[PDB]
Amino acid sequence: MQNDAGQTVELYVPRKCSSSNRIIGPKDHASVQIDFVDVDPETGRMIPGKSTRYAICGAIRRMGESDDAILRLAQKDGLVP
């Protein structure tokens, strides 16, 4: 958060679920961060050092919506048709 005369005096900016936009707290241990590797359409081999990061919060994972949440994020990013 921006404050003071323009400085940022926050200890750290928390992550937010890629699907529900909910903050992921320091003690949220049911939250996950899955990484998908990038590929070349023809060769089919992973591009070293390239990946897509998705973070899902414990609440969404616990409701069992993580499956379609990840699927919809991937469809949005083009990893899946």
Binding site: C17, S20, N21, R22, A59, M63, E65
Partner: protein
């Protein structure tokens, strides 16, 4: 018997937000509901919404942005004077840095910051943050 369409709509929005849904359907839509949602959208607490027409009260479909903590109605619509606006905001809103108190004044439905800018009192409708 239904007596507060705004209360029903805000409760539905809160429940959908808690469940993490992306859209919410609001039954008996009304002008007051539309203005409340417009204020919330202008402040960025919801996305776009559609007013579905059915030759009756109609419906609304709102897009939730996963950013609203609580949207609550205040009943009865107590009269708020410009002098006690400060007390009401301090009591109802979580902080002075965010959250809005929605009033209906002669000028129209607005938030407490705009009402204080224009030096208007009025009847309180609700609040969101």
């Amino acid at each position: 018997v239904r007596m507060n369409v705004l209360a029903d709509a805000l409760n539905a929005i809160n429940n959908a937000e808690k469940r993490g849904k992306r859209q919410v359907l609001i039954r008996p839509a009304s002008k007051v509901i539309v203005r409340f949602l417009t204020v919330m959208m202008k402040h960025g607490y919801i996305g776009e919404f559609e007013i579905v027409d059915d030759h009756r009260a109609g419906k609304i479909v709102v897009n939730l942005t996963g950013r609203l903590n609580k949207a609550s109605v205040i009943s009865p619509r107590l009269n708020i004077r410009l002098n006690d606006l400060e007390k009401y905001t301090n009591t109802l809103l979580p902080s002075r840095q965010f959250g809005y108190l929605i009033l209906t004044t002669s000028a129209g439905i607005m938030d407490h910051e705009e009402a204080r800018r224009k030096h208007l009192g009025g009847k309180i409708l609700g609040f969101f943050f």
